[PDB]
Symmetry: C2
Subunit: 82 residues, 2 copies
Amino acid sequence: HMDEQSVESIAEVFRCFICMEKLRDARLCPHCSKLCCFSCIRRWLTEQRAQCPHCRAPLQLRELVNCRWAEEVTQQLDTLQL
Amino acid sequence: MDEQSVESIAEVFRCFICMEKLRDARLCPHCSKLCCFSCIRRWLTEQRAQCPHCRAPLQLRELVNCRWAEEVTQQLDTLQLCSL
Ligand SMILES: [Zn+2]
Ligand SMILES: [Zn+2]
Ligand SMILES: [Zn+2]
Ligand SMILES: [Zn+2]
């Protein structure tokens, strides 16, 4: 149950700041490194305000970083959560 | 716990340049590969100012500070210990 809680601690890092679900098409804020689903952060920047939902820095959709490995890490974490 | 699942994840969180665990992890905005701050800064000074992986123009400032990287590194360590 300790390997279990380590997995869960990692999974928590790779959850969307906005919807707190596991990340789909992860995007990372360049200024603070918080991760969001593409759709979530797109909707935020587009319907809420042009700033990072966590760090509040000005932010346009195109400054967002594609976290290319996120989907693999996320799938692996799924495998681990038996 | 699948050993290779864990190892796959650990590969992601090794420094592309020195292969060790990340120290003050930075991420290349263009390909999102991770490097120790010190390693990538040396690289950019010594080698062409290109990501050692994306090979794309990369300067010190475009570098993303991965604030959660240490946390993950620490947990990975515990996971790897759990070979027992
Ligand atoms: Zn931010
Ligand atoms: Zn989301
Ligand atoms: Zn390094
Ligand atoms: Zn790169």
